[PDB]
């Protein structure tokens with residue numbers, strides 16, 4: 219009830235992160251993926267229109 | 268001894284002028300033995316030998332409050348304690364600038380007078396609490 | 408000695424004095440102990456500084472400039488020079504640009520005779 | 532498995548220390564600050580007094596048994612003991628001693644509050 | 655050893671860049687704080703008849719929970735961090751006060767990720783004012799229109815009160831329900847005027863004159879004063895955010911400095927040690943070459 223912290227144990231939630239991947243570049247990647255998904259959706263509409 | 272940090276420089280001169288193989292931080296490598304010969308002579312003798320004594324308060328110069336120097340650790344590896352004075356507290360008006368956390372006496376509890384022993388236990392508890400209560404707030 | 412009076416001894420950077428003695432020790436074949444300074448750093452510096460002392464017959468004060476290499480105080484030449492110093496007249500372009508002259512920054516400066524055992528109590 | 536999980540938790544705590552020392556604990560996600568509080572409890576629990584260091588720690592030395600050490604770390608790993616404060620784990624042996632220390636500290640803190648109430652009323 | 659010194663140098667440059675960036679944040683927040691401090695001279699006057707209308711004696715919780723059916727707690731959080739303990743203390747107060755009948759409509763992005771992980775089902779949504787345009791009476795109207803989705807029996811608007819630049823404490827507005835407020839107004843207008851709590855004001859003539867006021871106007875009175883309360887809460891939390899951010903940024907700069915001095919000491923230590931190591935290597939290879947020289951006479955005929 220407090221928090222569903224992730225971990226290696228089944229009652230805990232998924233830990234999809236990877237220690238090898240760096241955290242410094244994460245915000246740039248988040249912004250890039252958001253912008254790319256928006257552009258792809260707009261292209262879907264533009265192709266139909 | 269004011270101070271053993273300069274004795275080691277003199278021995279470093281003597282060795283390097285003789286082209287002996289140097290070691291860490293330019294020292295030959297036998298400077299540990301050099302200070303150990305001297306410090307081991309300081310002892311509390313047995314009643315068989317007169318029950319005499321020879322105390323030693325050596326002095327050592329750190330650099331920017333760094334106990335991880337070579338001579339410093341070499342002497343701490345010999346001595347029965349440590350009195351760490353801090354430039355921060357000295358400039359901050361606290362004089363003597365003893366940092367109680369970085370200082371210790373491994374043996375003096377047996378020699379401490381009981382009247383001082385009780386007061387020291389009380390003040391030790393008090394300062395172990397004070398060091399935590401001062402930092403945990405961080406001006407909160 | 409002879410005239411019986413105080414003297415100032417102004418010294419352009421002692422860093423260059425140490426550097427010259429280091430070059431001499433290197434050319435003589437003596438192993439550089441540390442970063443490149445001579446093994447006889449403390450001895451060669453003390454043979455000069457210990458002559459700079461007060462006497463019954465007079466006194467020699469010495470004002471010495473010090474270039475700190477890479478602004479590191481732990482370098483052996485500064486580390487040995489500072490051990491002999493008694494005062495520090497630090498200077499700053501900040502106060503100078505503020506019109507103050509002499510451009511001394513008293514807070515970061517310091518001295519050793521600041522003790523009532525040496526000077527009068529009111530001064531301290 | 533308990534040891535490997537403890538080691539993994541401390542690894543994450545080491546990576547988070549780089550941020551905690553700069554920004555602060557408040558700038559971490561709720562999961563991360565829970566992980567921090569738990570790893571701090573683990574590290575504090577790892578300390579125990581020894582009979583030899585009685586001069587220094589000022590405490591009687593404990594002999595934590597192997598079987599009792601695993602259940603304690605596992606309970607601290609599964610979130611089975613999170614209401615206990617962090618300082619209760621410092622310089623103790625076994626979770627029973629931890630609960631005793633927590634009771635002592637809670638009693639002392641309460642007693643300080645009633646003492647302050649009495650002083651303020653008399654003030 | 656080259657990798658170590660290169661690593662420490664990179665960390666030094668990273669801490670320096672991080673320092674000037676945080677300094678830039680401090681300058682921006684300082685500009686906003688110097689704007690918002692103009693409110694400090696002028697506040698503390700608009701809510702006084704609102705107090706007189708809505709305030710009641712300190713009611714203990716456990717009776718309010720049994721009396722009520724669906725309370726409401728509105729925490730006013732921030733849009734961006736580096737504030738301090740404001741958001742965390744708000745969450746701590748609500749998980750201290752957590753009870754089966756609550757509902758949380760918050761104000762800020764940081765109430766979105768935190769509360770939902772602590773309060774699963776009670777947390778509903780939030781409200782966001784991108785602070786390009788200063789808050790308004792109609793922003794508080796928006797917040798009232800969001801609160802009124804519930805048939806709530808009591809609304810505890812939590813916020814941060816700016817007592818000083820080093821003092822940003824918690825504060826609450828316990829708003830009643832309209833029907834309950836009207837009934838209490840009548841029941842307290844009938845009887846004589848007697849305060850039941852120190853620091854509380856008598857308002858019996860007001861609770862009669864409001865009876866002289868028609869129904870729609872009394873509903874407007876309630877909504878108007880609740881809107882002013884919400885607005886004062888938003889303004890006080892804005893100022894408290896901009897004031898505590900400076901404290902939670904100067905301490906960051908102090909920590910960054912300390913990390914930078916450690917990085918500088920380690921960098922210069924590694925530099926000097928590497929110089930000594932290269933020197934002792936060269937002298938060792940040279941010394942070995944000198945050792946490889948024989949002392950024999952190597953006599954030869956000279957005639």
Ligand SMILES: COCCOCCOCCOc1ccc(C(C)(C)CC(C)(C)C)cc1
Nearest residue numbers: 475478479480489492493494495517518519
């Ligand atoms: C209590 O009496 C003390 C008397 O001390 C006299 C000698 O003073 C020693 C001066 O020590 C320093 C230490 C650091 C520095 C800094 C780092 C500030 C010098 C700098 C800015 C050139 C790198 C300067 C002088």
